Structure 1
Amino acid sequence: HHHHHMVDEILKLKKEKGYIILAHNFQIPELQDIADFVGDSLQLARKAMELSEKKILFLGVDFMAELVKILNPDKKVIVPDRSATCPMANRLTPEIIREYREKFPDAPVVLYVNSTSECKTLADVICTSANAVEVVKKLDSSVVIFGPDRNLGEYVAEKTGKKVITIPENGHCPVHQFNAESIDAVRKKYPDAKVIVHPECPKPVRDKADYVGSTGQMEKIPERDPSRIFVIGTEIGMIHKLKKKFPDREFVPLEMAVCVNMKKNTLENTLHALQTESFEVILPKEVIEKAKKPILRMFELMG
């Protein structure tokens, strides 16, 4: 295989230098295939809680690399491309959060994991798409401040009956902005297929789906649903993951949807990363000390 030179050298260096390689589900198939662990934000966060290796190569976007570092402040965490980020997250700021606490006095601030680590220092609790409902239901408030994703916030409201105030204005993931007509069309084409979409999708999309959940949840659906065909409303990287796990089923994208940031990592710069042992994720001590609290609290409010 023509990538064997990079694949072989990555595997050698990883072992030689004592790295574990963690990848997100939206990484290119070639990177998923060389990772030690591949999963969603929640699964990655969980894995980061119990991590033994001294050195971590993280393949995803910066806010999750920073979460991994916050949970392992004394381990070396590296990323191939330091610019790999979530633009959604970058629109929420400390000032907006402070504005909204002042405005809504006793509302806890629940932040999605794609949020800056500085914003995490100001959060009461962190969540991901699979635990947001449970976490919000455990809080002793019928109103919460939630960001930066409006769709997940609005989903949480529907599921909890709580009032959810979303910040910032129109915070959303461009990648999950599917149109509901794509479901109408795929119903005609494959009348027996099951449609699975992410909670970051717009309401009309979620409402027409058979299932709504995190990518981690999506991966488990075929364990209990015998459907030959699944239609997947999330980033294209998930198709590879699903088809690997369930070679016996068909996985059809709802639409082609690519996160440019998730695609910044390549075989070539991942190799470079292991050769140079760069770029290290470095955070101020203060930020680690403060942001760890809403992160640990997320796991406390699941189990």
Structure 2
Amino acid sequence: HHHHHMVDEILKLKKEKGYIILAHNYQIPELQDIADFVGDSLQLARKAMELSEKKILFLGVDFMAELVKILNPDKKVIVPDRSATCPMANRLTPEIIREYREKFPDAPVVLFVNSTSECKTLADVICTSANAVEVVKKLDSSVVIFGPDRNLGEYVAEKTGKKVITIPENGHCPVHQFNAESIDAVRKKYPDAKVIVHPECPKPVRDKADYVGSTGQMEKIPERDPSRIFVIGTEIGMIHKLKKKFPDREFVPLEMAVCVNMKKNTLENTLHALQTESFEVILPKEVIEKAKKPILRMFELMG
């Protein structure tokens, strides 16, 4: 009854106070269901650019809320838990970027969107899981600096044939460290299922999958693949999203994988956020201006 109370009050306050709710794919299902749009980080930031509303309640982690703010600088962006963050992103530092630029000055700095806003001010181009191959393909250089995810960087090297210098050392997402034995098991249990895993997964997992793709790419695979069962190698929130879009398919987690930071957002603190209209995401004007440069370069490459 309190969830119904909270859901009803959340819906009431968002209309009353003029908020659009954007939720990342990895939010708990109860928050996905009250959001106006559910998607990946860049998808939500670009969706916000289209909106006539000027107030956004963002449900994800801090670098994503900040990406919304960078591309929507004149909108008020609030989050329910100001400590929700990406530990992988936080392991890459300005000092490491500057060190590697000095070592490899002819190598463009390609930063995965899962990166701090401060790191973005130092990057030559931003990329996402879905466009990293195309972005690195179109760059002039046969060598790039790439971070913060080593698995994604090595996947890009495989697909482009280019040299990819990854930073920091052992940059990785703990959520996507499935083991390849999980794929061996599902091949036995569901011999006709299609296995889709994220490019942030380790190479033995990527190489055993039917598809490697971002969450956005996962959402599009059943549009062209009629298989009845998909096994999904990413954070558990995506199962809810996929089942909602394709109710006549079955979606099976490769393993249970939970991002603790994504789960910091709850109905209760989401309600608190609408009641208090906090916590506002604020970036210095200078950070927004500098971080926009590699984001626009990414838009330009994607043509």
Give me the TM-score of the superposition, normalised by structure 2: 0.98
Q: Distance in 1 between matches of 2:144 and 2:15?
A: 45
Offset of residue 48 of structure 1: 3.2
Which range moved further: 190-199 or 9-18? Answer: 9-18
Give me the TM-score of the superposition, normalised by structure 1: 0.98
Number of aligned residue pairs: 303
Q: CA RMSD in A?
A: 0.9
Offset of residue 228 of structure 1: 0.8
- Equivalent residues of 1:42, 1:130 under 8 A apart: no
Q: Deviations over 1:113-163 (max 9, x none)?
A: 111111100001111100101111111111000000000000000011110
Q: Deviations over 1:29-82 (max 9, x none)?
A: 000000000011231232133332110000000001001111111110000000
Offset of residue 296 of structure 1: 1.9
Which range moved further: 122-131 or 35-44? Answer: 35-44
Offset of residue 2 of structure 1: 5.0
Offset of residue 301 of structure 1: 1.4
Q: Deviations over 1:68-101 (max 9, x none)?
A: 1111111100000000000001010011000000
Q: How many percent identity over aligned positions? A: 99
Q: Deviations over 1:181-211 (max 9, x none)?
A: 0000000000000000000000000000000
Q: Distance in 1 between matches of 2:4 and 2:266?
A: 14
Q: Deviations over 1:215-251 (max 9, x none)?
A: 0110111111111110000000000001111111111
Moved over 3 A (4+): none
Q: Distance in 1 between matches of 2:41 and 2:157?
A: 21
Offset of residue 13 of structure 1: 0.8
Structure 1 segments unaligned to the other structure (5+ residues): none
Offset of residue 253 of structure 1: 0.4
Q: Distance in 1 between matches of 2:144 and 2:289?
A: 24
Identify if the C-alpha distance between structure 1 residues 248 and 2 changes in structure 2 by more than 3 Å, giving closer, same or farther.
farther
- Equivalent residues of 1:243, 1:250 under 8 A apart: yes
Offset of residue 108 of structure 1: 0.5
Q: Distance in 2 between matches of 1:82 and 1:298?
A: 28
